[PDB]
Amino acid sequence: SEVPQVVSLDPTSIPIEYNTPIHDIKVQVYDIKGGCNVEEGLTIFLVNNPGKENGPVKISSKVNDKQVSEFLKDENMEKFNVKLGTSKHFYMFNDNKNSVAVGYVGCGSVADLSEADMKRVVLSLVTMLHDNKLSKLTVVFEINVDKNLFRFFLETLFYEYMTDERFKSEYIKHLGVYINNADTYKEEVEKARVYYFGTYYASQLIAAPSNYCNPVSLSNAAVELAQKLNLEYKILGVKELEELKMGAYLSVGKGSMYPNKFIHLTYKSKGDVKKKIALVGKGITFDSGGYNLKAAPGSMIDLMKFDMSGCAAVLGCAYCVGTLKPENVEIHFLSAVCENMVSKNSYRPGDIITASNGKTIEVGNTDAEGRLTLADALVYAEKLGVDYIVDIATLTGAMLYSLGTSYAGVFGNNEELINKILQSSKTSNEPVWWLPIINEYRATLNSKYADINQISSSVKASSIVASLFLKEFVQNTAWAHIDIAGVSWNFKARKPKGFGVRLLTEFVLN
Amino acid sequence: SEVPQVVSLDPTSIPIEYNTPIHDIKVQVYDIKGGCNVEEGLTIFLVNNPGKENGPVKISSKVNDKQVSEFLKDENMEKFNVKLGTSKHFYMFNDNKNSVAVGYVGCGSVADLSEADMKRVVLSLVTMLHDNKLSKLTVVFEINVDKNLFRFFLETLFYEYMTDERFKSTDKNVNMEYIKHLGVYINNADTYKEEVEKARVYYFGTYYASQLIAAPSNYCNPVSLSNAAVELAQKLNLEYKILGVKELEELKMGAYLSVGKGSMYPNKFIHLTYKSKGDVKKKIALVGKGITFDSGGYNLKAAPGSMIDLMKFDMSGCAAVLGCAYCVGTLKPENVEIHFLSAVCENMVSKNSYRPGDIITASNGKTIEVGNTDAEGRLTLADALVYAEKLGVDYIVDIATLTGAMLYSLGTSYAGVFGNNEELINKILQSSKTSNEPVWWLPIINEYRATLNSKYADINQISSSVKASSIVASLFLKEFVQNTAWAHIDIAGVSWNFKARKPKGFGVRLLTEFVLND
Amino acid sequence: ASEVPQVVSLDPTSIPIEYNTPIHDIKVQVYDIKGGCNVEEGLTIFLVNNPGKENGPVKISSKVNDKQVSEFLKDENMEKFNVKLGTSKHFYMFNDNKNSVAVGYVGCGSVADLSEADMKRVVLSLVTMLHDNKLSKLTVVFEINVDKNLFRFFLETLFYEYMTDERFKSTDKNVNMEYIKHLGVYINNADTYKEEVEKARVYYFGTYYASQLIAAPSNYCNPVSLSNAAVELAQKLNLEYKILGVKELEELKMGAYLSVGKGSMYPNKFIHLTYKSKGDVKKKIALVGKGITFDSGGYNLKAAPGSMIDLMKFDMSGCAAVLGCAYCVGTLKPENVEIHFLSAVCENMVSKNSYRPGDIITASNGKTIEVGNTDAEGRLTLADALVYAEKLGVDYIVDIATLTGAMLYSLGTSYAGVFGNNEELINKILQSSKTSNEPVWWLPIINEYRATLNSKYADINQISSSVKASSIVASLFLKEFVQNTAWAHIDIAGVSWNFKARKPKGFGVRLLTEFVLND
Numbered sequence A: 001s002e003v004p005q006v007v008s009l010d011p012t013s014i015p016i017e018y019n020t021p022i023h024d025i026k027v028q029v030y031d032i033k034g035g036c037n038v039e040e041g042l043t044i045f046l047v048n049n050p051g052k053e054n055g056p057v058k059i060s061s062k063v064n065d066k067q068v069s070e071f072l073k074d075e076n077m078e079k080f081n082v083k084l085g086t087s088k089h090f091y092m093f094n095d096n097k098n099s100v101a102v103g104y105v106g107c108g109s110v111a112d113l114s115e116a117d118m119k120r121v122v123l124s125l126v127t128m129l130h131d132n133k134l135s136k137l138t139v140v141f142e143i144n145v146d147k148n149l150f151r152f153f154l155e156t157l158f159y160e161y162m163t164d165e166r167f168k169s170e171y172i173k174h175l176g177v178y179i180n181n182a183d184t185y186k187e188e189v190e191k192a193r194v195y196y197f198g199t200y201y202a203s204q205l206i207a208a209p210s211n212y213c214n215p216v217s218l219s220n221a222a223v224e225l226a227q228k229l230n231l232e233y234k235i236l237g238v239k240e241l242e243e244l245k246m247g248a249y250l251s252v253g254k255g256s257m258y259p260n261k262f263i264h265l266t267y268k269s270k271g272d273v274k275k276k277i278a279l280v281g282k283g284i285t286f287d288s289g290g291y292n293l294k295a296a297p298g299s300m301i302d303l304m305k306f307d308m309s310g311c312a313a314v315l316g317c318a319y320c321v322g323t324l325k326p327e328n329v330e331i332h333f334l335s336a337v338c339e340n341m342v343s344k345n346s347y348r349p350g351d352i353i354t355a356s357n358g359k360t361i362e363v364g365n366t367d368a369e370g371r372l373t374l375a376d377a378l379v380y381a382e383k384l385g386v387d388y389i390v391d392i393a394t395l396t397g398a399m400l401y402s403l404g405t406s407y408a409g410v411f412g413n414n415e416e417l418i419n420k421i422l423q424s425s426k427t428s429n430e431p432v433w434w435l436p437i438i439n440e441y442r443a444t445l446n447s448k449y450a451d452i453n454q455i456s457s458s459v460k461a462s463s464i465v466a467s468l469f470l471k472e473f474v475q476n477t478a479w480a481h482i483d484i485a486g487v488s489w490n491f492k493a494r495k496p497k498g499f500g501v502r503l504l505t506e507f508v509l510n
Numbered sequence B: 001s002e003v004p005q006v007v008s009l010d011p012t013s014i015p016i017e018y019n020t021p022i023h024d025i026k027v028q029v030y031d032i033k034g035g036c037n038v039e040e041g042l043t044i045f046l047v048n049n050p051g052k053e054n055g056p057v058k059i060s061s062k063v064n065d066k067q068v069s070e071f072l073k074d075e076n077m078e079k080f081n082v083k084l085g086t087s088k089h090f091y092m093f094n095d096n097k098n099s100v101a102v103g104y105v106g107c108g109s110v111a112d113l114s115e116a117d118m119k120r121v122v123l124s125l126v127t128m129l130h131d132n133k134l135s136k137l138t139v140v141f142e143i144n145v146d147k148n149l150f151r152f153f154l155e156t157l158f159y160e161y162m163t164d165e166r167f168k169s170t171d172k173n174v175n176m177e178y179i180k181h182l183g184v185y186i187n188n189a190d191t192y193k194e195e196v197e198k199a200r201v202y203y204f205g206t207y208y209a210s211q212l213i214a215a216p217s218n219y220c221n222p223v224s225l226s227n228a229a230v231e232l233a234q235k236l237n238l239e240y241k242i243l244g245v246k247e248l249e250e251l252k253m254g255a256y257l258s259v260g261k262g263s264m265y266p267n268k269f270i271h272l273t274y275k276s277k278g279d280v281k282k283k284i285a286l287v288g289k290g291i292t293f294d295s296g297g298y299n300l301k302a303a304p305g306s307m308i309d310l311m312k313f314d315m316s317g318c319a320a321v322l323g324c325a326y327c328v329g330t331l332k333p334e335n336v337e338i339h340f341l342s343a344v345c346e347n348m349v350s351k352n353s354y355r356p357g358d359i360i361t362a363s364n365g366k367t368i369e370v371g372n373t374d375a376e377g378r379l380t381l382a383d384a385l386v387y388a389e390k391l392g393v394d395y396i397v398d399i400a401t402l403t404g405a406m407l408y409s410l411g412t413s414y415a416g417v418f419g420n421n422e423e424l425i426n427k428i429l430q431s432s433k434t435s436n437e438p439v440w441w442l443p444i445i446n447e448y449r450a451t452l453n454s455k456y457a458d459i460n461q462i463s464s465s466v467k468a469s470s471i472v473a474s475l476f477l478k479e480f481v482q483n484t485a486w487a488h489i490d491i492a493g494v495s496w497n498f499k500a501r502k503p504k505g506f507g508v509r510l511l512t513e514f515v516l517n518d
Numbered sequence C: 001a002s003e004v005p006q007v008v009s010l011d012p013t014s015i016p017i018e019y020n021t022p023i024h025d026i027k028v029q030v031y032d033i034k035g036g037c038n039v040e041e042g043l044t045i046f047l048v049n050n051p052g053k054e055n056g057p058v059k060i061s062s063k064v065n066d067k068q069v070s071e072f073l074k075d076e077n078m079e080k081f082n083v084k085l086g087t088s089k090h091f092y093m094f095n096d097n098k099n100s101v102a103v104g105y106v107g108c109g110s111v112a113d114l115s116e117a118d119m120k121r122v123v124l125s126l127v128t129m130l131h132d133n134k135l136s137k138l139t140v141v142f143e144i145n146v147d148k149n150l151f152r153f154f155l156e157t158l159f160y161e162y163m164t165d166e167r168f169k170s171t172d173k174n175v176n177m178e179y180i181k182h183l184g185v186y187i188n189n190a191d192t193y194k195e196e197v198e199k200a201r202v203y204y205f206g207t208y209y210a211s212q213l214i215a216a217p218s219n220y221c222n223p224v225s226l227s228n229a230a231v232e233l234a235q236k237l238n239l240e241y242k243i244l245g246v247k248e249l250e251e252l253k254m255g256a257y258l259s260v261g262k263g264s265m266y267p268n269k270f271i272h273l274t275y276k277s278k279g280d281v282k283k284k285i286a287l288v289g290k291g292i293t294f295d296s297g298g299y300n301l302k303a304a305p306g307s308m309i310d311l312m313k314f315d316m317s318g319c320a321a322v323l324g325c326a327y328c329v330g331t332l333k334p335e336n337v338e339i340h341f342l343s344a345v346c347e348n349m350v351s352k353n354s355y356r357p358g359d360i361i362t363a364s365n366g367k368t369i370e371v372g373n374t375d376a377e378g379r380l381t382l383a384d385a386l387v388y389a390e391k392l393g394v395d396y397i398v399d400i401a402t403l404t405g406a407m408l409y410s411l412g413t414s415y416a417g418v419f420g421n422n423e424e425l426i427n428k429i430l431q432s433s434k435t436s437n438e439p440v441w442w443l444p445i446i447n448e449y450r451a452t453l454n455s456k457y458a459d460i461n462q463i464s465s466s467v468k469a470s471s472i473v474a475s476l477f478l479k480e481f482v483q484n485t486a487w488a489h490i491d492i493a494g495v496s497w498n499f500k501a502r503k504p505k506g507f508g509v510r511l512l513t514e515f516v517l518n519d
Ligand SMILES: N[C@@H](c1ccc(-n2cccn2)cc1)P(=O)(O)O
Pocket: A287, A298, A299, A300, A307, A367, A368, A369, A370, A394, A395, A396, A397, A400, A485, A486
């Protein structure tokens, strides 16, 4: 629990913001039928033009203000176009001589917006929010969104609007929404607020640098979260880890000044437990690569505080699950947390180490540390006797060359479990794609001396090879593995996505 | 048709072997219930032991010979196990008092062999053929295989057995003799018999593609390759047309023409057509990337790992498409019209080459800013796709060694398929299953499209920011298909067998099964 | 001759060659030390050591035929100076005839037998005294022991290093460039050393001639201009000559050599010079040099850091040494031998017409070759040159080539490597290395690596897939093209260019000549 310091100025906890301005926003959803009132703040119409690419803006909603109605006449609005993410907004006096701002965000030409399209719409809305002092935003939907996409709009809106100022040395108070069939959308609001925080909380852990967020401070943070949500909790220290023979996980942490800490939180429904689930996140608080130092061009060592993104997603999931309280399930939230460093004490390339299931592993590359920690976490997970194990991890840079920065990859040993993940991707709107575990490549992990190799020498499909490795540590339980190495960090916006929180929560809930 | 030469020693045609030793093999299929005769050559039992990991060898089938039956008694076989790939040879005298060779190949303990597993069986089998002058092989199936798997066994046997000596002169292998007879014993032989000549056809289509791929770029250039295609079309009685530069200029194929600018070989666009005799119910265009050498152009393949010495293989897609034309032209399916297309050229460094930054105009009027001259495949394919869609077809399928990134996504065993049409994609996946050429569906992620935006041209050739080049290339290609079901098979990772140092001829069986099942 | 093609009219159409050098105007007189030294005009340098006494004091042992100078050079006066290898001092005084004379010494250290490397340091120090001093004469007094070969080596190196190549200077010629007209040498047993003097002058020019061809840039020295210079040389020496052009190379089916030159604007030219003794021929020898006038790498372009593409005009160093040897042999006229001087000359360029990585080409002996890297072009040209050589029906084939950059990692910049298929011939090369003072080291042809040249499609691979010992692999490749003749291969990739001095060495001329002469 006590965070070691090198100098007295070294931080001993991760700063965490729980009560955010987003939580003070009162949201009201009205049906478009009856007309829209425009009384104050900013009012933005979400507008498309099907077929007509870069077509003119045309507002179809009745507005119950004569000055604003005149502004929104076809002749005026056609001066503007609906190209995706394009916006205009104008200040004017309404019927009461009150200052109001009115504008639109273009939603392009397709009737159904993808999650990527919707993020661009939101980003354009958020730019307006960041540039105007407003007590209120009103958004009018003249496009089609289903319940999940509506909730996604709110989650993204909240997440993108919120600004993380923890390391630096006026938000709207009201949100109105006009949408057709408003009554069906109302229940999405408070769910969105919960999903927003899980995601934002995960983002806070990820964005926190490795001096602040280390294995001791991160496990401490998880205990605090568990205490607030009344989850059972257990942090495993080195002595216990040694007793459990977690040789793969411990070896990765040998070169760190921070002792390894294994996080185990448990949610348990009040009723009968019908499904048991273990969620496992990769928890490397900084990945230097170890003796295989990240020194090659493009290795992005300055990003590597993000290598606990999987742990963050899992803890973000525990927030949502602990808040929403699903029935009939028992959820274990697990992460083998450590730091991968260079030291007289570090493990070396070539070292042979022994995992908790007795398998000996030849280390081919100390920068393939994630799969070693996951190996012992997977053995620990299966001993819990669960129905499903799902891990999520920034595991392989190869993901950038396969699916890229938008879609995460999912691998697994059970087709039914994979389809549940894919369905959860659909309803969470966090995109995932099923990639194969190709058994033909398994032979490349046949070590000359140890039971198995950590990495392949010859096969470049490393996301698949890593999955083959992980599979060796799940013996008879449905397991899926989500590789978020490509999708976790938003490179353009210079911040985490908190990717996976909503995916995992939808998986648990539905 | 005349192949330009720099010196008189430059080859002016690709050597093709049409009648291979495999074609001289007389294949006979017998039902296993009648028992096996062991008379001469080498008789091999394919055995498994379901359950027991490396369980003993048990010879179940009847053997119409007292002497040999005594030999293969469980007592004598107990010492041998069925571990995948294991083989043993036996020597004995039959009731005739003649000496016979017998043996087995282990097929493991799993009761349903995989495509990769069966290949390991065949490879073990080929090892037994390779340094033994035999007149006849007999194979007895004591394992279960469906019709497709049986065909796959034969195809793979034929392909691996065959050795390409077109470019050997001094280095003989003078100990080479092919069996003249193959006997097969299998349960319900009557259903399997039809698979024999189908397998032989598939073998050659695949092996033909292999010959074009392995043929180096001085032998296989755009003129010689299009010449070979003409000769194939003539042998198969297919209609054919080869478009030359003047015609390609008239068609305004500026993306394709630009790639070939730096080559001493004029661009040649291959167009073969197979048409069924009856009602035509489906029209299909098969498009193959046909870069006969890919130097990279001014974006020269000089970086570590760029494998410039492999780049004669960059017309693998074209080879696949021509191999498919062999099978389709031989099998003659009904109700169908197939167009076999390749925009053939060579990507070279010259005073005449196109340059990074050049803006060029495709045949559909779209201007393209060339960001990297080594992304040349998608440019040639753009113009080929436009041409294909003008034929007014139901399906366009292209196949290409398009992106090295495939090695990082699916690797060397599975090709990737991308597309704009789920039904077409499903048909290709079904064709993958029945051809036993593995393919995996990968997504066209529209979010990356904005990164192909050009400040000056209509579209950029490559992405500024996205590293998922297999997807970006797919997004680029999709811009050249307006309203037709289309799929794209990226075979960059699977085309070359790096371990065996030879091409696979990947895609011939996949495309043929697609054509046939439709 | 052939016409050199030009892209523009300002493209040079011949290599500038200086035949009558200032070194050739130098009159050399050798005296026996026992007669005493006359000390008059110019600069008189004593070569002095002190055996065992590291940095020991200078002592002038020779009789000096002048009272003033003898007094000046007496032990007490000289003890303030020391013999540290390479150090030197200038003296000024008036002699017995009241004329001012310049005197000095170069220190030759404390080890009695000077290595070839030590002697070069002594010579360089001496040359430093000749530069920037307008002298009419230099006199050198040997107070160190040198055998006949080492004495000749001194003279050769002096001549070579003193000479300054200004062929490509225009606005920057040295205004003060002025050479001695006389060289005096005092040495014990002078009559035994006299025969080495003109031999040294001939060896110097062969080496300097090779140097001129190598230093000449690839626009000046291309396959047409280089073969033209070989013709001119042959005419001046009365050697027989034949230059094979493309049509003749095609007829001989030299596909490996032709493929390399496909991408060049300059047609391939195969040089074949022949010296025949007037006597009865007892030995026949072919000397083959790699003649790549520029090596860009071809499609395997030299773009990697350290590939030194700007040095690649030097890739005809082997051809240059063979031609330099032709000069020496044609001048000294050895008896009872017939020597063939051979080079498959071409240029390795990037073009629409270039051969490609992966191409399969057929050598003149029928062997098909899979090209794995267009930058391993030397061994391809040498393949056909070796087949051509063996058909001449000679007793020995020796090739010399800047073949593998790996040499720098094995033997470095001072020692060349020799490989071969015949021990007797290798020892004769090593023996010639001793007498020429151009150091060579015997390296193995490791047959275990041969399998790594097995091609899946062609008869043989040009390069290894797995073996990094490229100097050895290259030698294995070359051996496949000599069937039944004693053959040796000298890789001078590391030693040809003097990186410190920024000039070629003309390495191999003296080595090869000694080889021809000793036989
Ligand atoms: N932390 C993993 C990782 C994750 C992402 C990236 N990466 C993401 C973008 C570019 N590189 C590299 C390594 P690892 O080094 O494979 O353990």
